């Protein structure tokens, strides 16, 4: 999607494993602001949005 | 909750090795990344060296890529910086930057470090 419409997508009832993300060997940024990525995976939040 | 005391700095002949270390002391299972500082004279602290402790992928810039090699040892908790073929252009303050928010490179200095007491690295 485009910055004009990046729209705000409900993705609801599933799953997302991150270390897959973890072992990509392509990311430049990883922020992760409020809680730490480590602690990301085994507990999780409401408003899932993306 | 993350103090770094860091060694292994002196004066060496170009062309040849050191050495540098910097042991973390504290929160340690809390970091996640290993940030090499270098802060020329008449220059901008820049970025050299990057570690991940979860994946143990490492990331070089252009001017120190196939020369410099990170490390890590988790029995002592200390990074590691080994330095080979050095040239004259490295002369600078180092120092050593540990992450508890993720990884990000480039390195940059504006964003949140646990920041070293900083040695001097001097080569001719």
């Known amino acids: 999607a485009s910055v004009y419409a990046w729209n705000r997508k409900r993705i609801s009832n599933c799953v997302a494993d991150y270390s897959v993300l973890y072992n990509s060997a392509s990311f430049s940024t990883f922020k992760c602001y409020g809680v730490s990525p480590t602690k990301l995976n085994d507990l999780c939040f409401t408003n899932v949005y993306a | 909750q993350v103090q770094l005391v860091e060694s292994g700095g002196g004066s060496v002949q170009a062309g040849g090795s050191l050495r540098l270390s910097c042991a973390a002391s504290?929160?340690?299972?809390?970091?996640?990344?290993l940030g090499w500082f270098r802060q020329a004279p008449g220059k901008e602290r820049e970025g050299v060296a990057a570690?991940?402790?979860?994946?143990?992928?490492?990331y070089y810039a252009d001017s120190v890529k196939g020369r410099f090699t990170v490390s890590l040892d988790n029995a002592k908790n200390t990074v590691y910086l080994q330095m080979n073929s050095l040239k004259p252009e490295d002369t600078a303050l180092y120092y050593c930057?540990?992450?508890?928010?993720?990884?990000?490179?480039?390195?940059?200095?504006?964003?949140?470090?646990?920041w070293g007491q900083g040695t001097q690295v001097t080569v001719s």
């Open positions: 570690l991940i402790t979860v994946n143990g992928h490492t």
């Open positions: 504290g929160s340690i299972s809390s970091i996640t990344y």
């Open positions: 930057a540990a992450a508890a928010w993720g990884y990000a490179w480039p390195l940059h200095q504006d964003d949140y470090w646990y």
